[PDB]
Structure formats: C-alpha cells, structure tokens
C-alpha cells in the first residue's frame, strides 16, 4: 500500500509513454501526408 503507489507511479510513467508513442506516430503520419501532398 506504499508499494502500490510505487508500482502505479511506474505504470503511470508507462501510460505517459503510451501517449508519447501515440503523439510521435501522429506527427510522422502528418509529415508523410504532407509529403504526398507536395508530390
């Protein structure tokens, strides 16, 4: 019940990294879309 906070702070960081992955995939997706637009 201190370890529960510890491990879900760890997986809280993991959930932030999941959102981070979603962000960077969206950015390079929009970049490839703009590349097709320029072509």
């Amino acid at each position: 019940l201190i370890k529960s906070l510890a491990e879900k702070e760890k997986q809280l960081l993991e959930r932030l990294e999941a959102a981070k992955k979603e962000a960077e995939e969206r950015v390079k997706r929009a970049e490839a879309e703009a590349k097709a637009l320029l072509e």
Binding site: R15, A23, R29
Partner: protein, 62 residues
C-alpha cells in the same frame, strides 16, 4: 490503490486528451493542405491557361 488509481485514470484521461489533439491535428493539417492543394491546382491552371489564351489572341492578331 484507490486515489492514485484515480490519479492514473486522470493520466489515462490525459492520454485521451492527447489522442483527441492527435486526431484533431491530423484532420486540421489535412484540411488546410487540401484547401491549398485545390487552390494551387486552380492557381497554376488558370495562370498558364490565361498565358496560353493571350498567346493565341496575339498570335492570330499578328
């Protein structure tokens, strides 16, 4: 763990808000660049078409 599970569900709501902003950014960029694709299409078409037309006018006149 109750209250920091609620804090981590607020974290999943931040994931939710970030994917909202992700989809919103993809649609915003696609829409504005679609507007520019059609506008630049019509721009270069009508410009070179007007040059072609004026060349035909002055050619037949000469």
């Amino acid at each position: 763990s109750k209250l920091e599970a609620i804090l981590s569900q607020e974290v999943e709501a931040e994931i939710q808000a970030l994917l909202q902003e992700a989809e919103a950014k993809a649609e915003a960029v696609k829409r504005e660049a679609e507007e520019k694709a059609k506008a630049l299409l019509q721009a270069r078409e009508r410009a070179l078409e007007a040059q072609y037309r004026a060349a035909l006018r002055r050619a037949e006149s000469a």
